[PDB]
Swiss-Prot record:
This is Chemotaxis protein CheY1. It comes from Helicobacter pylori (strain ATCC 700392 / 26695). The keyword Cell wall biogenesis/degradation does not apply. Keywords: Chemotaxis, Cytoplasm, Flagellar rotation, Magnesium, Metal-binding, Phosphoprotein, Two-component regulatory system. Mg(2+) binds at residues 7-8, 53, 55. InterPro entries: Bact_response_regulator, CheY-like_superfamily, Sig_transdc_resp-reg_receiver. Binds 1 Mg(2+) ion per subunit. The keyword Coiled coil does not apply. Interacts (when phosphorylated) with FliM. Chemotactic response regulator protein that modulates the rotation direction of bacterial flagellar motors. Plays an important role in the colonization and infection of Helicobacter pylori. Upon phosphorylation by CheA, interacts with the flagellar motor protein FliM to cause clockwise flagellar rotation and bacterial reversals, as opposed to straight swimming when CheY1 is not phosphorylated. The gene is cheY1.
């Protein structure tokens, strides 16, 4: 279960990576921006799950998701968006783009653990 976690917040990347570790998901690659994330996916198509935010310079998460879904290798990759964009217009936009599970920031570490366990369980 190779995961890629994309967020331009260093503290958020830490929280997510620690939470995944608590759930037994130890094989985690990070990215700060969409460009870097895409490069990593394109070069490591064995990646199993994409976790991404929305707002960030160097390609945002909506465009990253669109790009992922248009690639023949990633038609079925699970995509979790974790974002402060809590409005339903934005949720709808992201789901149309190919996001499968939407988690809205902010959260305590315990809440994130509960919400990720809902989608990924433990490993
Ligand atoms: Mg962001
Ligand atoms: Mg936050």
């Amino acid at each position: 279960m190779k995961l890629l976690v994309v967020d331009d917040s260093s503290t958020m990347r830490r929280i997510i990576k620690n939470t995944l570790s608590r759930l037994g998901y130890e094989d985690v690659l990070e990215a700060e921006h969409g460009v870097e994330a895409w490069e990593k996916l394109d070069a490591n198509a064995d990646t199993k799950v994409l976790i991404t935010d929305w707002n960030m310079p160097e390609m945002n998460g909506l465009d990253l998701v669109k790009k992922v879904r248009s690639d023949s290798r990633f038609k079925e990759i699970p995509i979790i968006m974790i974002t402060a964009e809590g409005g339903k217009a934005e949720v709808i936009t992201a789901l149309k783009a190919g996001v499968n599970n939407y988690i809205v920031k902010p959260f305590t570490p315990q809440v994130l653990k509960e919400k990720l366990e809902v989608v990924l369980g433990t490993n």
